[model samples]
Target: DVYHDGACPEVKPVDNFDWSQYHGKWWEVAKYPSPNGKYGKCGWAEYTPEGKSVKVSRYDVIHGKEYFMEGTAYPVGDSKIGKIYHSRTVGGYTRKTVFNVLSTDNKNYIIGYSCRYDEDKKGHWDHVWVLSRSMVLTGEAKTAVENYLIGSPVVDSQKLVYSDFSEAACKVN
Candidate 1:
């Protein structure tokens, strides 16, 4: 379901991104259908500024358990542009991904977009995320991010769904 027709479309990123303000925990408020079918209802991410890239840890529920993936995110051309490259290994597979941060307040919310051309499928794969500082995004922040995603061409508007948190599944270990 990640595959789409045509070439990978362009999604512009934000301007003047500050890594310092962006380092912290972020909850997954909403997202398009993810390729990884194991992910459960609750998920979160953490970012830490390290050198030119940022250390990222994505925590999610998998089969009613906690699972995490670690990665490093670097800028494409300028670190201020918000187009970042992420590299990580899961199980035995290691690869790098490119995602565009359409907008971020560096505080409460972030909206991201990603698209990749799959040669085998002869199609493109697109992903989008609406993250927030809280478990469930609400009011102005949620409304604004939804509006932003609706305006983007690369996002699959119909596939977007809320990821409500499950505190029991997010226990510290």
Candidate 2:
């Protein structure tokens, strides 16, 4: 859950989301805190065509080794919203994560929010991410999004972590 304290705000998905330009690779610019702290430097996500669904390829590095996970995301009642199910299973269980396209230019940046039921199913927390078309996310770029998130229900924008995606750090065979 992204908003661990159960202070979920109203969700407002973008209008007329264009999926055509939403495809391809996206570099992780900044992310809110996660329960598992799963993402690391050089992290990225790739969207591709897969039958009637969209294929999601997420990559990251840990301890000098690159890891990749595959998943399928399908429209969840609208074009601006979708849910992802990963190929990997944990304890033979799969979790469905849904996200809404808050804003995107279909070229430079993508900002979004998501939420999922907690393990006990009593409540859920919200999550947010800032992605970019380039590996290097400039301070101005981050400030732009942070300013927009102010007064929102998402996690504290001050807690976002920018990861390294230098050419050498991101290279994988």
Candidate 3:
């Protein structure tokens, strides 16, 4: 009787991200509030087929304008496979971005503690998402991913918000 009326999702574990499916683009499906004090931007994770690295992108928004701030995603060590460490290789912007997985499949990712090194280390999880190959996520899948994020010990469920269409609604050409 532990079922959640089809609202909660089934969970799985991965020692490493399958870099192939991790490639392409993933839209933010849902997330907690931005403890980073930023708003209206989009978040994504992209990996190459070579299985060596991933890229995490966080867009910036003020009023209606939108832009991106991105960095490389690299593996740290064992016991940290699903954990992605991010930092901008480009000029100026340098916020230590990190995403610790709550769970994931090949395509979709369930992440936590993202944005700012201090916040992540403090266990202040403000964002979560169910990134996928497509723009929108299925209701069931969204619920499942949301369920996992909200229940995590490190996550702040109340701050969660569905990101705007600025990125999540774009057609993948």
Candidate 4:
């Protein structure tokens, strides 16, 4: 079932955000200990801070949809501590909000996140976005992020699974 209470509402993209730098698309990299909420498999959403709002798409076994969510994603604090752009409808939930960037190799970035927005927390919820310049991930890009997930201490890569991004099935009209 979809979670909506206390969920984030859609808003316009924050000013001063470098849209060009964030122009690329993204995909799910890894997740932790049996997916919770409405999530199944890994999930990801796209963003274009250049636009008025940050467009979103998600892949989950239950209710994954492409471009199903649109909201403004802004930095939480100093440093790219990360931001959350999510759906504002009754179905919108912000449990897996993106956090900070732990590492990057230019082509892709390894992002960190928290489920409930707290520090020094463990095993609550986390996400990693393998962002790229393209819509879909290349073999190299996939491996790069996958490898990072496997090595990262935060996520349990052994049980990790990739999200299905079937454009034909999830395309938004």
Using TM-score as the measure, the top candidate is 1
Q: Tens digits of per-residue lDDT for model 4 on 1-173?
A: 11123423322222333333554456554444334644444345565653544545444443443324454454555323334333344455543344455444544554443434223433233444444544456677667766766776654455444545565434444
Sorted on lDDT, highest at the top, how do the candidates line up? Answer: 1, 2, 3, 4
What's each prediction's TM-score?
A: 0.86, 0.76, 0.63, 0.50
lDDT of each: 0.79, 0.69, 0.53, 0.45
Residue-pair clashes per candidate:
0, 2, 2, 0
Please give the distance, in angstroms, between residue 127's alpha carbon in candidate 1 and its true position after superposition. 0.9
- lDDT per residue as tens, model 2, 1-173: 35454534567776766667758999887777666756566788898988867788888874467888887776676665433233434587876666776766557788877776566656677777888988765576656666667856555677776777766666666
Q: Write the per-residue lDDT of candidate 3 for residues 61-87, one digit (tens) a residue.
A: 534556576667765555446666665
Global Cα lDDT for candidate 4: 0.45
- Give the higher-TM-score candidate: 3 or 4: 3
Q: Which candidate is the best by lDDT?
A: 1
**Predicted structure 3: lDDT:** 0.53
Least well predicted 10-residue stretch by lDDT in candidate 3: 1-10
Off by over 4 Å in 2: 1-3, 80-92, 119-123, 138-144, 167-173
Kindly report which residue pairs in candidate 3 clash with one another: 32-160, 33-159
Off by over 4 Å in 3: 1-16, 35-37, 41-51, 60-62, 78-80, 90-98, 115-130, 164-173
